[PDB]
């Protein structure tokens, strides 16, 4: 009924309909700025007068049951937002800034949103190597990437295919984000002492077949998780590394004996999210044949290649892009990578071995998908390196 | 609470009668799912209404001597169950999940369940070679394979035959599984610092003849185990490798110098369990000669080759399988292999020597049992990747 | 204090007891050249080298052994080691310095005496796992 209620209701509506992940309500010196994050990038949504800030912040706080009187400290909560047909769970954060409290609302995905592995975006050759890796009966499979590059989606996509009812599937998550039926899920509880490592150790007395480790971030968790792969369970675990090969060296640095890494690691998936060209303003462009050679492609790939980029329309808010698409780097462990691990070879040398044995780098997968007009050269060089 | 009690009793009794190894009491969104593991795979048992969860978890915590008040942290303990002819210990573990605590109950085997070596399922020629190795007066004999592949059964089967009253037999275990009479058993106790290595060092002052190391997980344990063998004790020890030759390279990788391996190691047994085809719905099948070729079957053999599967019937729960069977790959160390180790040859090179010397691989052993209809070919290929 | 250690320590003797091969069932074994090689023996030395064990007889139980014999590692401190102590180099570094200036290790000493039939190589290898 109030204007603030009406603005909050409207902007969540817009976020839902546009697949925005985050709403930012930012006090500035002489107004309030509201931005939506869509396909990973912020874009402007609207502007409010400074006088509208406390009414809007209150509406958010009430939603999450936060304290309106407390304005000098950060607060955070959740609300299940239900309006019209919309039924979305939201993470609500409030923070003091020099011009007032800032609000951030995150729209949380559900189990219904997890795709089957066939729609994960894998290129033809790498997808065959992918499902062979996830098909192994035991070992540790690492999934690596910076925040919001799709690690959880990939992880649970896999478990949707392989966590069959003849097996016990057990997760430890921080927090649990999806209700996946058929698997058993446990949330780390800091207040209680239920750390990652503490729960992992208990899983070994829980007759598991598949263990999912949401975060490997201390040495004990790294050692137990590798131990569970070695003894004969399938372990799917997430790591922050820039690279597939670096996940191997990271485990080492974290104190996992190299001979256990060689013995248990079945592979490493590195991934990123790139933006998809908007169809409705998609247009062909001509690339410099040279700029494709300096990026690494041979002349047969340059000969057929047509590029695309979005011009900017209402469907895409002028960006040229709508939605995102994954790009991958899949390291599958074979004998030669095992010997390199035992021999202490560097990340760089391990990468060379993986490539000679057929690993496509992140950039190479990116360019391939660019030559299919899925994304731009722009985006491939934005989100990758040599 | 009495209806809870009534249910724990019947599920434990049924698992025991059905030869289930594990009971899973799993709280879900709206109900409580209950599953039995039989022959390594899980089956549905029953479904409870979500209201029954706490009554059941409570019955089970009390049975194990666990704390009803503690629901935020995991708990484990042991259950000494007695109820008619049924006499079974259970390892009990409770664990917080999003929908409440999940309980797991593992049925523990006994000394009376441990077979004699002649009933381990060894093929004729391999059995004689096995008898040879386990009879050597000193050296380290390694039993390798993933979890639940029969390693402890084989291990205590051997000790049943060689652990005689004129020897001191001593084990270090995590935990001690069976109380075997005639044999000294010591449990890993980390709350007190008695680790695998700590015990193993102590054993060397215990005038042993036979030492059984339940698990060689770290480099210290590998070295003391090898020092035990080099000192003149016989050592039965368990490792996690995918085949026999890889046990040799793993000892090197863990820091045992090849000249120590070469002097200490008498043999490696890799093994797996495959499900056993249900006799009641067994059906002959005609093999794919492309497959039999690719698995190295001489066309002489491929001509008489028959394979088998269980159709799936009431007697095997529609699984096509009832019971399990073991498959082995026994690598016996001789002079040629001893040379290969000190010459630094790879696991692949060592295996090719062993095979030429007559060792059948895991796949070869399973293939030969599938050719008799003991198991399916599919089950053999699923445990030999 | 490392400076007090450097000024005072004149040497360190480390030792082990190995079992002694019985004299009445002693017998030759052809050693593997590779074993001796990886034990740091010169190829000239390998040419002649023979090893021994006890086959077991009435005079030694069944054991093949009777009595014990010592094997030695003698670290004699010089200016360089003194310098390494002051500096604070590790036990492994001191060991390689002392070995370079000519210190034989336990296993080298053990092998030498095994090459004369005092003990088996297995006894030596048993005693010298670092
Ligand atoms: N394969 C994919 N293709 C397109 N978009 C994807 C894909 N996977 C994930 N996304 C989008 O990326 C968002 C974040 O993905 P996800 O939670 O899997 O990332 P994450 O890397 O686990 O992030 P966090 O850092 O929060 O753990 C998802 O909500 C979804 O919108
Ligand atoms: N030779 C065999 N034939 C048939 N079944 C067997 C055989 N050996 C073991 N089993 C079955 O497999 C179960 C597990 O065996 P065992 O405990 O020896 O495996 P393990 O490899 O020691 O497992 P863990 O890795 O947990 O120690 C036994 O309880 C028994 O049911
Ligand atoms: Cl990304
Ligand atoms: Cl939980
Ligand atoms: Cl198995
Ligand atoms: Cl001594
Ligand atoms: Mg996530
Ligand atoms: Mg066991
Ligand atoms: Zn557009
Ligand atoms: Zn049947
Ligand atoms: Zn004698």
Residue numbers in the entry:
A (entry chain E): 15 to 400
B (entry chain B): 15 to 399
C (entry chain C): 271 to 400
Task: Give the original sentences from the paper that presented this experimental model.
A third vital component of the TFP biogenesis system is the assembly ATPase (PilF in T. thermophilus). The TFP assembly ATPases are part of the extensive AAA+ superfamily which form molecular motors, using the energy from ATP hydrolysis to drive mechanical transformations. The domain structure of T2SS and TFP biogenesis ATPases is similar, in that they comprise one or more N1 or GSPII domains at the N-terminus, followed by a C-terminal (CTD) and N2 domain- which comprise the ATP binding site. Here we present a combination of X-ray crystallographic and cryoelectron microscopy single particle reconstructions of the PilF hexamer in two states which are used to build molecular models for the complete PilF hexamer and chart its structural transition on binding of ATP.
Crystallization trials on the complete TtPilF hexamer were unsuccessful; however, limited proteolysis gave rise to a fragment of approximate molecular mass 44 kDa which was purified and yielded crystals which diffracted to 2.44 Å. Mass spectrometry was used to confirm that this fragment corresponded to the C-terminal half of the protein, encompassing the N2, CTD and Zn-binding domains (designated TtPilFc). TtPilFc forms a flattened hexamer, with 2-fold rotational non-crystallographic symmetry relating the two trimers. Inspection of all 6 binding sites revealed electron density consistent with bound nucleotide; however, there was no evidence for ATP hydrolysis in any site. ATPase assays were carried out on the TtPilFc fragment which showed that it was not enzymatically active, confirming that the fragment is catalytically inert in solution, as well as in the crystalline state. Thr651, Gly652, Ser653, Lys655 and Ser656 form part of the Walker A motif involved in binding the γ and β phosphates. One possible explanation for the failure of the TtPilFc fragment to hydrolyse ATP is the conformation of the linker polypeptide between the CTD and N2 domains. Significant differences were apparent between the TtPilFAMPPNP model and the TtPilFc crystal structure. Superposition of the CTD and N2 domains gave an r.m.s. displacement of 3.47 Å for Cα atoms; when viewed from the top, TtPilFc is wider by about 6 Å along the long axis and shorter by 7 Å along the shorter axis, leading to a flatter hexagonal shape. We find that TtPilFc is wider and flatter than its equivalent density in the complete hexamer in the AMPPNP-bound state, indicating that the presence of the N1 domains does affect the relative orientations of the ATPase domains.
